[PDB]
Design a protein that fits this description.
- Residues 38-52 have a biased composition (Polar residues).
- Disulfide bonds join 17-35, 25-117, 64-89, 111-127.
- This is KiTH-3.
- The longest helix is centred in the last third of the chain and has 6 residues, at 136-141.
- It contains two helices and eight strands.
- Strand 5 (92-97) and strand 6 (102-111) form a beta hairpin.
- A six-stranded mixed beta barrel has the order 3-7-4-6-5-8.
- It has one domain (1-158).
- By secondary structure, it is mainly beta.
- The structure holds chloride ion.
- The site of chloride ion has 2 residues, from loops.
């Protein structure tokens, strides 16, 4: 249902790193961020699905190596804050899902939480601030159906 996003810090539904601002999309204001929550040994996050390939929705090549990737690679993009100007590029993280399954994946790109809602991004909103955007291989390795679109995970460097 419709609830407050705790990363945004609204409290409109109460009792019933902060956003940098907003970008307005399909009549909806999306928060922008230059930051993400603290990276820990067990960093809570949302896993979404991204097409990293030449024939895909992901826009340009991946930031880290300026290349496209097969979606059978275990690879992720990270929200701007976590991407941190490329400091985690080429490194492995370990993702753990709610079913207790785990997978390692290589950071190859940024899930950009500063920009969006325009022609360069196809009218897609800016990324949220707590996102690990994984390939199909990441999803199937955790035993998850990418059709649910988003799941809770934790991650850390590996
Ligand atoms: Cl720690």
């Amino acid at each position: 249902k419709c609830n407050d996003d705790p990363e945004v810090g609204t409290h409109i539904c109460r009792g019933t790193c902060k956003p940098s601002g907003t970008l307005t999309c399909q009549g909806k204001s999306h928060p922008t961020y230059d930051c993400s929550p603290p990276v820990t040994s067990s960093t809570p996050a949302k896993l979404t699905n991204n097409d990293f390939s030449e024939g895909g929705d992901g826009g340009g090549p991946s930031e880290c190596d300026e290349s496209y990737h097969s979606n059978n690679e275990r690879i992720v993009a990270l929200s701007t804050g976590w991407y941190n100007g490329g400091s985690r590029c080429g490194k492995m993280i370990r993702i753990t899902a709610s079913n207790g399954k785990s997978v390692s994946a290589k950071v190859v790109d940024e899930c950009d939480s500063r920009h969006g809602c325009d022609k360069e991004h196809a009218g897609q909103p800016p990324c949220r601030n707590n996102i690990v955007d994984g390939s199909n291989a990441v999803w199937s390795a955790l035993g998850l159906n990418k059709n649910v679109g988003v799941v809770d995970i934790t991650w850390s460097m590996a």
